[PDB]
Design a protein around this ligand. Sequence first.
Ligand SMILES: [Zn+2]
Length: 257
Amino acid sequence: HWGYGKHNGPEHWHKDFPIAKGERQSPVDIDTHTAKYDPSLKPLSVSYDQATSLRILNNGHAFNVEFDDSQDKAVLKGGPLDGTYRLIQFHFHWGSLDGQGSEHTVDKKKYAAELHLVHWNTKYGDFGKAVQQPDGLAVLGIFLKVGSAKPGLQKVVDVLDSIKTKGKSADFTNFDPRGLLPESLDYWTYPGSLPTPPLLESVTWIVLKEPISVSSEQVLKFRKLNFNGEGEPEELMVDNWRPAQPLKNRQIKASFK
Ligand SMILES: [Zn+2]
């Protein structure tokens, strides 16, 4: 149905998902002059010590590394969050060229890619009930710039050949998401939504100030994936990002001075 092409991309999404023109849509541009530091924020807790990855897959839009969320094994607490959010999966958004690929921007500056770690409020039982509530999801966003290779990313990059096209999957165990984080946990936060259809407005966004560096070679592996299924016309999985949306009446809060 939907995608990132000319006839099924971000400018067509409102037709099937009218909430695309809603009040708390993501992504957004982050204006550092108006993104005020918020002294009420508590420190963010990233607890990935017992994360249990299950698999990696191509869903026709991106690749998703899935995790066992049946217990508190990889969770996010603190920050602006009320309670505990379990990591269910992570995936990236990237461009054709280094010059673009991120969803969020900082003072209009676009990064080569953006990692998203998706988490759901255990108040709700499972992902399914959680995605429909305003306080239902917590996505940790992390920008990627091009430079030194990211060692923790290599395990992912080395299995992408196995999931080239939509519908493919493969066993993917013992992957450690702590290996994808930058040094600082400095972040901006605002109430948003899923950047992909159904675009439900149920996500508390936490975007880290410090990008990670990944090598031109790792990102180049990303680019060889396809949006299409085996046997269909070969469509390179590139530019799977939605551009910035109006901030509207929202405020972006900084965890740092
Ligand atoms: Zn995403």
